Ligand binder design. Structure first.
Ligand SMILES: Nc1nc2c(c(=O)[nH]1)N[C@H]1C(S)=C(S)[C@@H](COP(=O)(O)OP(=O)(O)OC[C@H]3O[C@@H](n4cnc5c(=O)[nH]c(N)nc54)[C@H](O)[C@@H]3O)O[C@H]1N2
Ligand SMILES: Nc1nc2c(c(=O)[nH]1)N[C@H]1C(S)=C(S)[C@@H](COP(=O)(O)OP(=O)(O)OC[C@H]3O[C@@H](n4cnc5c(=O)[nH]c(N)nc54)[C@H](O)[C@@H]3O)O[C@H]1N2
Ligand code: F3S
Ligand code: F3S
Ligand code: FES
Ligand code: FES
Ligand SMILES: [Cl-]
Ligand SMILES: [Cl-]
Ligand SMILES: [Cl-]
Ligand SMILES: [Mo+4]
Ligand SMILES: [Mo+4]
Ligand SMILES: [O]
Ligand SMILES: [O]
Lengths: 133, 822, 822, 133
C-alpha cells in the first residue's frame, strides 16, 4: 500500500459555521491542530453550499510554531519568523521563510447530512515523518 | 505529498554553506542509498530526532523541498537531505526560504534542475546543437588567439562574477582572474553587477575602512543598529533573525553587561534610512515597538544630505570622540567645513522632520549616562551602493561614523550587509583606466564577449540598450555562419572573425542554465555549483568555510576554475604549435586536476615567497588555511584574517577589524572626506522632470537574484508568475489598476512590464519593482548614469505607467496580500 | 521507483484514443483522488487484476510512466493511469512506447509537461513576457484587420495542421478551416507537413480510389502484404503487431478459410519496397522466415520503374482480371503502352534482380491453384509519398493494383498506412492556385504568419533557407517594436505593420510548448490536447472515436477550435465597431462555448439542408454521429461512412470501400494513368553528382515527431540526446568515425549535425538520419524540389559528411547496439 | 516507512562467474526471475573486482514475457514485441515498445568473502504493484 490511512473525523455541520469565524479541531490526531473557516466568498477547492469552506493545519511549515488566523486579512500568521500564508489561495506563502505552503485539510461536504468531515491532508504537517504517525 | 524518507543513523554527512546570500548559513547534506531509510526512534536516524510522536516547534526545519533523489554518473540513486546546522554560529539552525530549497535545486534529470547545461552547446548559424568540449575549446581559444594576434587583448571582452558562494568563491575567482588578467591580459572586463572593473566601496576603502570590519556578534552587542539602503529581513535574513532581533528582544543584554560591567545598556533601537517602508521596518516595529524604531523615509537619492546634516549636528553638539579624532584621524576640520549643513536645510532636502533627525542623533551618538558613547553599528547596502553617487554617499556616512568612533569598538562597525558571499583571490587588474564595458559593446567594440556566471540581459543598468545591441551584433555572426558548408574549425574562426569586422560579436556564456543569454549566444559551456564541487567562501563577517563535494555534476559540467584551466591549456597548446614561445608562456600555470589545485595556487600563495602579485581577501596568512583544516573547523570555519594555526587549537582568526585605531591607509589614520551635495544627476533629473513615478527596485525575500533556479520551481512560478510592481492604492485607483493587472513601465531608456501589486505603505508617486526577473526585466528603465568610478545609480530612475490589461489567471492564482507583517 | 498506486474499484474511467499515430489504439484513463488507492485483490481495483501474486505475461501493460498525479484548477490532486483497452479491436490491449507515455505527457506543474504554454506570451521587442488573452487578441486581430483592409487576405499567411488526433481532429480542423477559409478568406495557407494547400494522394483520388479504402481486418485476410516506402513496426506499430503478424504466424488462416470455403490460402507472405533494410524487414524475417519475406531494396527514387516493370510483366503473363478491367475501369490499353518497361530494364533501373521481380509478381498476382487471384494488400507511406514524384509513383502503383483487382476485395486494398490520425472537416480552399508558401515567405511576402500546431523550423523541406529568412524577417519586427514607449495597441499594430512594409514579418505560434519557433515568434498562444478537451478523430481504417475530457488544461490554455472562435469574434467586434457590416458578417458563426459546438457546426452539418459547402471525411451521414453515440460505441467507435443509426443497433458503418466496383469518379470506373519514368529530378541529381551520401531520413520507433514532449523526458534524452545518422561501417572506418562521434552533414542546401550510429545493414554510400529533431535538424539538407502539386521529395537528397569530434558522454551513456531484432 | 523491505539474497561468489556466462537466480521471490553476468569489461555501476558484474530482472517491462540474454550482443531480447535492452547501459531500451528500462538488481560485492548479494531493485518489475509482494 502506497497511501497513509487517514481517519474520517467529523468537524461540524456547514450551516453552523459563521462567515469568517474560525473553528479549531485536531486532525489527523490530537497533536495536529487545525482550523476550518467559512470564508464568505467562493474560493477554488472551497466546500459547502457556498464553496467557501477551507481548512488547514496551523503548524507553521517553517519551524512549527502555531500560526494564528487573522480575520481581517484571511491569513495565517507565524510571529516566530514572520511567515504569512493566504487562506484564500490554498495556503500560498505570501512572504516568509517556509518552503511549503500551509497544508490543506481535505474536507468532504455531505449535502444529505450537512456534515463536514476531515478526510485527508494535502502537504506534509510540520514535525512529522508522515502525516499519520 | 505526505511523508519523507529519514536519513539512516549511519548516513554520510557533509558540510555545505548556503549557495546564496552573504550570510552564509551552515547546512549539512545527508546522502544515502535510495532504497534505505532511518527509523523514527531518535538514535535510529541521522537527525537524532524522535519521530515516534509529534516534534515540538523549533526542533527541526524539514520539508519535502529539503530532500531529493540524485542519480550519479555510475547510475546509482541516492536520497539527499539538505538541512540547517543547529550548531553553526551564523544561523543557529535557521534556514531561509532560499537556502531551504537547496536540495530541490541540486541537479536531477527529472526535477527543478532538469534543464541544467550538460554539454557544450553551439548555435550553428540557425540552430542549437550539442558540440564536443574539444570542438568548443578549438573554436573559443581559436577566436581568442586570432583576436590576440590581430587586435591584442583589447578585442577580448568579459563580464565575470567576482563574488563568493555558488558561481564564485576563492577557487573560481582565481581561475578566472588568472585567465583573464595574467594569461589573456585583457583589461576589457566588467563584473557581474557593475559595468567596469571597480569596487562598490572605493570611498570607505580609501578612507582606511574595509567594508567588512566586524563580527555578526557585534549586532548582538550594539545599543543602536542603523540599516541604510537595506531590507535585511528579505536580503540578509538569518543575520537579521539570528543576531539583530535577539538584541531588539532583550536576549543579549546580559552579554553586553558581562562584557562591560560599568556601562549602561538601554533597550536596543533601530534606525532605517530607506525611502520605502519595507517588511524589515514592519517586523522591527512588531518586535521592538514603534517607539524603538525610526524610519527615516528620505526622498530618493538624498542620503548625502542626511549624513551631512547628522555629521554637522553631532559636531555642533560635541557628540563626537575628540581624543579618537586627534590620535587616529586626518581631515576632520576640513570635513566639518565642506559638509556643513543645518538641520533645517537637511530636513528640506530629505523630507525628514527636524525632530526625527535630532532623535536619530540623540539615540545614536549622545553619550550614555555612564559616560560612554552609544555602540552604534552602521549597516548599509544597495540603497546607497547603487544610490545617488556611490563615492559621495560613503564619504558622508563614513565621516559621521569616524567622528563618533563607531568602528573598532565592539557593538559597532560601518559595514556592508553584503549580497553574495565573498571569495576573491585574483591578479591585479591589468589596465590603469576604468572602462564602461556595456558602452563599449553598444558602440561596437570587441570581437568576443564571454558572460561567465552572470546574466546582464536581466541585470545590466540601461539593460534594454544592451540587449538590443548584443542581439544585433550576435545576428551578424549568425548570418555569416549560415553560408559555411563542411568548414574546418580554422575556417569557421575566420568566418566569425570577419563577421566581427563587420559589426558582429561572438557571444559565449558559461553558466548552469541557458538563460535569456541563449537568445544571443553562439556557445554555451556547462558549469558546476557547490556540492558538485568543493568550494570555499566567506560571509559578511569574513568567516571562511569549505562547502564539500557530495555528488557528480550533470553530464560534462565542470567547475569554473577548471573551465578556465581548460581554456588556458587550449591556448597554450595553440601557441606552442604555432611556434610562439613567449605567448605560450603567458598560459602557463593551469596544470589543475581538481578545484583544490586552484585554492592552492591562488588563495594559498598570496604574499608567499616567489608568488606573483595576488589580491586576496585571505591576505598573506591564507596559506594557513587548507581544505582539511577547514573541514575540521566545521561550518563555524574561521574569521579572516587567520592569525595562527596549529594541531592543538586549529585555525584562530580575527573577530573585529580596527580595534587599535590603525586603519588601512599610508599613515594608519582614518581619513575624512568632503561630501558635496549636488542634487540628483542631470540624466536622472531629466527622467524625473518628464515622468511621474520613482521606479525603485530590488529584492523580494522568496526570489533569488535572476531566478535561474526559481524559474523552474512550480511553487515560485505559482507565486510570482511575473515581476511585480508595488504601487500606492490611490495611484492604482487613478490608473484603474488593481492586483493582477499588467502594466507597462517606461521612460526614455526603455519599456518593461509588471503585474500590479497594490501596497498601502508605498508613497504616492513612488513604486517598487522586483529587479532582474525572468518575466518583465526591471533594468530596461534604469539610466546609463554612473558615478566617478562607473558605479550605476540603479535606484535612480523615473518613468510612466500604463495599464495593458487584467490578467484574470493572476487574479485567480496569485496572492496580492500584504508582505509587511502587522 | 518500485511501486504504483492501483486505481480503486470505483475509480472514474473514461475513453481515450492514443494522441499520436494513425493506428489510434484504444486506451482507458482512470482518475481518482491522490490519497486513495485500490486493493491488490482483483475485485478491489479497477483493472480487475490480481496483484496478490505475480501476474502472468501478457496480462497487463503497466509501468510508472503510465501513471501521474495531475492538479486541477480547483487545486485538487488526482492520480491518473492511462492504459490500453484490452477489448478495443484496433489494438487488443497493446500499447506502443509512444502511447504508453501518455500519462507522463499529461500536464503537471512538476513533470514532463512543466514547460507547457499556459498564458499568452509576447516578445515585446527584446524580451519574452506574459500578456493577457484580450491584449493578444487585440494585437493579433488588429494586425489581421489592418492587413485585410489594406492588402487583402493575401497578406495573411498560415501553416496549420490538417490532421487528426492530438493537435488535430474534426473540431479543430473545422474551427481553423472556417476561420482561415470562410472568415479571413486567405489562400496563403500551407499544411503542417507540406508547403502548399494540397493532398498527399492526388493521383489515387483522381483515379477514383480514396487512400483509406479497407479495414485493418483486411491485413488478417491477405495472402500477401506489400509495405511500400514504409517501416510499419516503427511507424504504425500496433497495426503491424495486432493484424499483420498474426497473419504471418498462421493465426488467421481459419478466418480466411471460413470466409472463402473454395479458396486455397497458402502461408502469408510479405514484400517490402524500401532502399533500406529496416527493423520491419528484420522482424518480418524473424517471424515468417527468410523464404516468406522479399526485400526489394530498390535504388532511391526508383519506385515508378519498379511498378511499371511489374505492371508490364503481369499484363504480359495474363495475371490480371480482364473482366474487372472491362466492366469497371478506363484507360488500361493506354497505360499498357505508356508504362511499358521490360524486366531487364526494370532491374537495371531499380537494381533489383530479375529473379526477385518475377518472384514478387508470382507470389502476389499469379492465380492460386483454386483459380482466384491472390489477395494482395498494397500499403504505402512516406517512402513514396515523399518519394521521387509523388503523383507519378501513385499513378504507377495504382495501375498495377487496379489491373490485378486488389481494391474492393477482402484481404486487399491499396492504402496509405497513415501518419497522424485523420480528422478533416473544412470549407473548400478559397482559391484555384497552388502556392508554395515557404518560397513566398522567403521572397518576403506576407505581413503576418501563424504556425498553428506545427513547427516547420524542424520540419520544412529546405528548412535552413526557411529558418534563416523567418529569423531575419522576425528581427526587423523586433527592432521596430523596441522604439515604442507607452504605445497603445493600435499604435503597436501600426509600428509592426510598418516594419512588415520594410521586409518584416509578424510571427505567431499556437502550440502546447514554445518550441524552436520561439526563436522567431512575437506571439505565442497556449493550446489544449485531448483529455484536456474532448476530441474526435479516425484511424487508418476510418474508425471514428471520441477521446473524453478528464482534466483541466494548464492555466488559460484552450482548445484550438475555441482559439479560432476567439480570433473570429475579436475580428467581428472590430469590424462592427468600425461600421463595416459586410466584413463583420464574414466572421459570423463562431458562437462556440465548447469543442462539441465545433463538431456540431462542421462534421455534423456536412451535406445538410442549408449548410455551406463542407469537405468532411464523415460525408453527408456525419450528422448521425454525436458525442453521446460515440461514447456508447466505446473505443471500437464506428468505421466511416456511417450507414445507419438507431437506438437498438447503434452506429453501423462501412468496413471496406469499392466492393461493388463503383469508384469515386464521374463514370464510377477506376481510371488508369500514364506513369512516365524521368529519373531523379534534376535538382536532386545535381546534389547526387556533387556529393557522396544518400541522405535518407524518417522515423525512429521511440521518438514522436518533433519531440515536443520527448525533449523533456529524461529517458528519451538519455537514449537520443542528439539526432542520429545510421551509417555503413566501412564508410565509418573510411571517415574514422564510430558510435557517438558527431558529424556535420551538408550539401548546397544546408548543413546540420548528427551523432554517428554504425549500422551493418546500411548500404555503402547510403545513410539514414532521424528527421524533425530538437538537436540536429535533418531537413536542412533536403531540397526545394516538389512534384506537380508541390509535394516535396523529402527522401531525395545527397550530401557529404565530415567528422566534428568524439562526444565522450554519448559514448558513455548511449547504446549504439543494433535496433534490428535478429 | 517509505521503503520496501527487500531481502538480502546470496547469488554466488564473484570468482565463480565466467565472463559472459549468465547466472539465473530469483529475486526478490521465486516468481521474479533474474540474471547476473560478468560482462568482461567495466561498466558504470558494475560490481566485483573488475567492476563488470551486473544483474537484471528478466521479465520484459512491456508485457512481461521472459527475455533471453544474448551473449554476442550483451543484450536481453523479448521475442513477443521485439524489445531489446542493453546489459551494458543499465537496461537502456535499444528499440522496443516498453516504457521502462530493464529493472537492475542491485548487487553488493563483499571483498572479505567474495560474495555477491542481491539487495534491492532499481525499477519496477513487470506485473506487480510493488517489487516486494
Ligand atoms: N531574497 C534575496 N536576498 C538577496 C538577494 C536576492 O536576490 N534575493 N540578492 C543579494 C544581493 S546580490 C544583494 S546586492 C543584496 C541586496 O540587499 P539590499 O540592498 O538590502 O536590497 P535591495 O532591495 O536591492 O535595496 C535595499 C533598499 O534600498 C532602498 N533604496 C532605494 N533607493 C534608495 C536611496 O536612494 N537611498 C536609500 N537609503 N535607500 C534606497 C530600497 O527601498 C530597498 O528597500 O541582497 C542579497 N540577498
Ligand atoms: N515512432 C514514430 N511513429 C510515427 C511517427 C513518429 O514520428 N514516430 N510519425 C508519424 C507520421 S506523421 C508519419 S507520416 C508516418 C511515417 O511512416 P513511414 O513513411 O513508414 O516512415 P518514414 O521513416 O518516414 O519512411 C518509410 C521508409 O521510406 C523509405 N524510403 C526512403 N526513400 C525511399 C524511396 O525512394 N522509395 C521507397 N520505396 N522507400 C523509401 C525509408 O528507408 C523508410 O524506411 O509515421 C507515423 N508514425
Ligand atoms: S539560508 Fe541562505 S539565502 Fe542567506 S539567510 Fe541563510 S545564507
Ligand atoms: S499506442 Fe499510439 S503511437 Fe500508434 S501504435 Fe498505438 S496509436
Ligand atoms: S516557525 Fe513560522 S516563520 Fe519560522
Ligand atoms: S512483452 Fe516484451 S516486447 Fe512486448
Ligand atoms: Cl516542500
Ligand atoms: Cl578591422
Ligand atoms: Cl516507467
Ligand atoms: Mo549583489
Ligand atoms: Mo506525417
Ligand atoms: O552585490
Ligand atoms: O503525414
Amino acid at each position: 500500500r502506497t497511501t497513509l490511512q487517514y481517519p474520517a473525523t467529523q468537524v461540524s455541520v456547514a450551516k453552523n459555521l459563521k462567515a469568517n469565524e474560525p473553528v479549531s479541531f485536531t486532525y489527523p490526531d490530537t497533536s495536529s491542530p487545525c482550523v476550518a473557516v467559512k470564508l464568505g466568498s467562493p474560493v477554488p477547492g472551497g466546500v459547502g453550499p457556498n464553496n467557501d469552506i477551507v481548512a488547514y493545519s496551523v503548524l507553521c511549515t517553517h519551524m512549527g510554531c502555531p500560526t494564528s488566523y487573522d480575520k481581517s486579512s484571511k491569513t495565517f500568521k507565524c510571529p516566530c519568523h514572520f511567515t504569512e500564508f493566504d487562506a484564500e489561495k490554498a495556503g500560498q506563502m505570501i512572504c516568509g521563510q517556509a518552503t511549503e505552503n500551509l497544508p490543506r485539510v481535505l474536507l468532504r461536504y455531505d449535502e444529505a447530512s450537512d456534515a463536514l468531515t476531515a478526510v485527508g491532508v494535502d502537504g506534509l504537517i510540520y514535525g512529522r515523518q508522515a502525516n499519520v504517525i | 505529498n505526505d511523508r519523507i524518507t529519514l536519513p539512516p543513523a549511519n548516513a554520510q554527512r557533509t558540510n555545505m554553506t548556503c549557495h546564496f546570500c552573504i550570510v552564509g548559513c551552515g547546512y549539512h547534506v545527508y546522502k544515502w542509498p535510495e532504497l534505505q531509510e532511518g527509523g523514527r526512534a531518535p538514535e535510529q536516524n541521522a537527525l537524532g530526532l524522535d519521530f515516534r510522536k509529534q516534534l515540538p516547534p523549533l526542533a527541526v526545519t524539514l520539508t519535502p523541498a529539503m530532500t531529493n533523489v540524485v542519480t550519479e554518473h555510475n547510475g546509482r540513486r541516492y536520497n539527499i537531505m539538505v538541512v540547517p546546522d543547529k550548531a553553526c554560529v551564523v544561523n543557529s539552525g535557521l534556514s531561509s526560504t532560499r537556502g531551504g530549497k537547496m536540495a530541490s535545486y541540486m541537479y536531477t534529470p527529472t526535477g527543478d534542475g532538469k534543464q541544467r547545461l550538460k554539454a557544450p552547446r553551439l548555435y550553428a548559424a540557425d540552430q542549437w546543437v550539442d558540440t564536443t568540449w574539444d570542438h568548443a575549446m578549438a573554436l573559443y581559444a581559436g577566436l581568442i588567439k586570432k583576436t590576440l594576434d590581430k587586435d591584442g587583448p583589447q578585442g577580448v571582452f568579459f563580464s565575470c562574477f567576482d563574488h563568493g558562494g555558488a558561481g564564485g568563491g576563492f577557487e573560481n575567482t582565481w581561475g578566472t582572474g588568472k585567465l583573464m588578467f595574467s594569461a589573456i591580459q585583457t583589461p576589457m572586463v566588467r563584473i557581474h553587477n557593475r559595468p567596469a572593473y571597480n569596487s562598490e566601496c572605493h570611498a570607505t576603502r580609501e578612507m582606511g575602512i574595509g567594508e567588512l570590519n566586524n563580527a555578526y556578534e557585534d549586532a548582538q552587542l550594539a545599543d543602536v543598529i542603523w540599516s541604510i539602503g537595506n531590507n535585511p529581513y528579505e536580503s540578509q535574513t538569518n543575520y537579521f533573525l539570528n543576531h539583530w532581533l535577539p538584541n531588539l528582544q532583550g536576549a543579549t543584554t546580559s552579554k553586553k553587561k558581562e562584557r562591560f560591567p560599568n556601562e549602561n545598556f538601554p533597550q536596543a533601537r533601530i534606525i532605517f534610512v530607506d525611502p520605502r517602508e519595507t517588511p524589515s521596518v514592519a517586523i522591527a516595529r512588531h518586535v521592538a515597538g514603534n517607539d524603538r524604531v525610526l524610519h527615516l523615509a528620505i526622498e530618493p537619492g538624498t542620503d548625502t544630505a542626511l549624513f551631512n546634516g547628522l555629521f554637522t549636528y553631532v559636531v555642533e553638539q560635541g557628540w563626537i570622540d575628540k581624543p579618537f579624532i586627534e590620535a587616529h584621524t586626518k581631515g576632520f576640520d576640513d570635513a566639518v567645513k565642506t559638509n556643513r549643513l543645518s538641520l533645517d536645510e537637511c530636513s528640506n532636502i530629505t523630507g525628514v522632520p527636524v525632530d526625527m533627525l535630532k532623535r536619530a542623533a540623540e539615540w545614536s551618538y549622545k553619550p550614555k549616562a555612564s559616560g560612554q558613547a552609544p555602540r552604534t553599528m552602521h549597516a548599509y547596502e544597495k540603497g546607497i551602493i547603487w544610490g545617488n553617487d556611490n563615492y559621495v554617499i560613503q564619504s558622508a556616512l563614513l565621516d559621521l561614523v569616524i567622528a563618533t568612533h563607531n568602528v573598532g569598538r565592539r557593538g559597532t562597525g560601518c559595514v556592508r550587509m553584503g549580497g553574495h558571499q565573498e571569495g576573491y583571490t585574483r591578479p591585479p587588474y591589468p589596465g590603469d583606466k576604468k572602462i564602461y564595458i556595456d558602452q563599449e559593446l553598444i558602440k561596437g567594440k570587441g570581437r568576443i564577449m564571454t558572460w561567465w556566471g552572470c546574466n546582464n540581459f536581466q541585470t545590466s543598468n540601461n539593460a534594454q540598450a544592451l540587449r538590443e545591441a548584443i542581439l544585433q551584433r550576435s545576428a551578424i555572426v549568425k548570418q555569416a555562419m549560415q553560408k559555411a558548408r563542411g568548414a574546418t574549425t580554422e575556417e569557421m574562426v575566420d568566418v566569425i572573425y570577419e563577421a566581427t569586422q563587420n559589426g558582429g560579436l561572438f557571444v559565449t556564456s558559461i553558466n548552469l542554465y541557458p538563460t535569456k543569454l541563449a537568445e544571443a549566444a553562439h556557445l554555451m559551456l556547462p558549469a558546476a555549483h557547490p556540492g558538485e564541487m568543493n568550494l570555499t567562501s566567506m560571509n559578511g563577517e569574513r568567516r571562511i568555510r569549505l562547502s564539500e563535494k557530495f555528488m557528480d555534476p550533470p553530464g560534462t559540467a565542470m567547475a569554473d576554475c577548471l573551465i578556465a584551466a581548460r581554456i588556458a591549456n587550449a591556448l597554450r597548446d595553440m601557441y606552442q604549435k604555432d611556434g610562439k614561445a613567449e605567448m605560450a608562456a603567458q598560459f602557463e600555470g593551469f596544470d589543475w586536476k581538481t578545484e583544490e589545485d586552484a585554492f592552492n595556487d591562488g588563495f594559498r600563495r598570496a604574499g608567499q615567497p616567489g608568488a606573483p602579485a595576488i589580491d586576496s581577501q585571505g591576505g598573506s596568512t591564507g596559506h594557513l588555511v587548507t581544505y582539511d583544516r577547514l573541514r575540521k573547523s566545521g561550518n563555524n570555519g574561521v574569521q579572516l584574517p587567520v592569525v595562527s594555526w596549529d594541531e592543538s587549537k586549529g585555525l584562530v582568526g580575527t573577530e573585529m577589524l580596527y580595534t587599535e585605531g590603525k586603519f588601512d591607509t599610508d599613515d594608519g589614520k582614518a581619513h575624512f572626506k568632503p561630501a558635496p551635495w549636488n542634487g540628483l544627476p542631470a540624466t536622472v533629473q531629466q527622467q524625473k522632470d518628464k515622468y511621474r513615478f520613482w521606479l525603485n527596485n530590488g529584492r523580494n525575500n522568496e526570489v533569488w537574484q535572476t531566478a535561474y533556479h526559481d524559474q523552474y520551481n512550480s511553487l515560485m512560478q505559482e507565486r510570482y508568475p511575473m515581476a511585480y510592481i508595488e504601487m500606492n492604492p490611490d495611484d492604482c485607483k487613478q490608473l484603474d489598476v488593481t492586483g493582477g493587472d499588467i502594466v507597462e513601465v517606461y521612460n526614455d531608456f526603455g519599456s518593461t512590464f509588471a503585474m500590479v501589486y497594490p501596497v498601502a505603505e508605498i508613497k504616492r508617486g513612488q513604486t517598487f519593482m522586483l529587479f532582474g526577473y525572468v518575466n518583465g526585466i526591471q533594468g530596461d528603465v534604469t539610466t546609463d548614469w554612473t558615478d566617478r568610478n562607473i558605479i550605476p545609480y540603479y535606484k535612480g530612475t523615473w518613468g510612466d505607467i500604463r495599464k495593458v490589461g487584467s490578467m484574470e489567471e493572476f487574479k485567480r492564482t496569485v496572492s496580492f496580500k500584504s508582505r509587511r507583517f502587522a
